[PDB]
Ligand binder design. Structure first.
Ligand SMILES: CC(=O)Nc1ccc2c(c1)CCCC2=O
Ligand SMILES: CC(=O)Nc1ccc2c(c1)CCCC2=O
Lengths: 193, 193
């Protein structure tokens, strides 16, 4: 039942390793999931809906892990706290690079994909701003830029910079260096005067 | 002669204000430039080649202005020097938002567009790294991250953050706030310990 649906999802993520979504057919997903093309359409209206589902699970996985961190503050310094949070996105999306890559491409053509990314980026930025505000209230960070504007730029930096690393774009920061790179920029811009 | 070519270019940039490149036809460019469809093909092989030319001029305009700044150091403080340089990209691309928007979309489908962006981003990052290195040599900046890796992340931040502002994406930094936002993050991460 839902086992056929997981098969479609797994086939799509596996196939997106080798070719873009345009080079994947609904017949390709059916064959890989051991079903017919009509049966596929019972589970998903299109191949784009398959990718939307895959991206939704990856994004919610990252959101939920961030939630877990929030409820369980790690006993460590401020730089490592920021590192642990940025690392949620590094590990979650870096463990699903094919879905991440195809998800960013689909933003240009899928209203749902664009709304999904926008909704969660708005959420993660608001949470970033609230932490920055808490730190300022504590006297731990100076009151420089508006916290929400600072948080917006730092989150967009991570989105673009992580994506470039995962895809091996030129230019990009090497994937083994990108976490330390982003943490440095977050910590200096949040706490610096 | 070249006056027909400028007409095609102007028509394309004007039309890209209202619709994506997919909704612009070669007939649309011909009509707007006062020529026939066969005559258009004498000047450009495709509508994508028209956008490539438009993006090439905008990118070279920004590159040349940055060159001008380099040769003519502004007598001012370090923060304003960085501001003046980031402002090249703010003003150049912000004065050609339609071409900027369509140019970023075409990266996903045009090898030439992708190579063009990559070549100039590599150039601007190397120049950023060389300035960071000079400042460290002078004792004006601490030796924290590898300069080229830091420069890579800060340039990708500006690319993504400026684009989001120009397009009015949600989320984005308001366009009237984005210059101060990026300068703060550049200056704190370059000079901060
Ligand atoms: C895209 C991205 O990396 N976002 C991000 C990273 C880290 C953190 C937050 C958001 C919320 C505040 C706490 C935190 O550590
Ligand atoms: C995308 C972008 O904003 N790049 C950028 C901005 C500013 C500067 C440089 C590159 C080169 C070093 C000098 C400088 O001021």
């Amino acid at each position: 039942g839902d086992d056929r649906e997981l098969a479609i999802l797994a086939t799509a993520e596996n196939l997106l390793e080798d070719r873009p979504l345009a080079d994947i057919s609904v017949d390709d997903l059916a064959k890989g999931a051991g079903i017919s093309r009509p049966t596929f359409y019972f589970y998903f209206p299109s191949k784009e809906a398959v990718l939307l589902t895959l991206l939704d699970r990856v994004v919610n996985q990252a959101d939920m892990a961030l939630q877990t961190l929030a409820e369980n503050p790690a006993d460590t310094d401020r730089e490592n706290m920021w590192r642990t949070g940025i690392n949620v996105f590094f590990e979650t999306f870096g463990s699903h690079k094919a879905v991440t890559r195809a998800g960013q491409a689909a933003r240009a053509t899928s209203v749902e994909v664009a709304e999904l990314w926008s909704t969660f980026m708005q959420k993660w930025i608001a949470y970033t701003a609230a932490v920055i505000d808490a730190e300022r209230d504590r006297g731990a960070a100076p009151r420089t830029l508006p916290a929400h504007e600072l948080a917006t730029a730092l989150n967009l930096m991570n989105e673009r910079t992580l994506f470039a690393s995962f895809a091996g774009e030129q230019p990009s920061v090497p994937e083994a260096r990108v976490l330390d790179t982003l943490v440095h920029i977050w910590v200096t811009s949040i706490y610096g005067e």
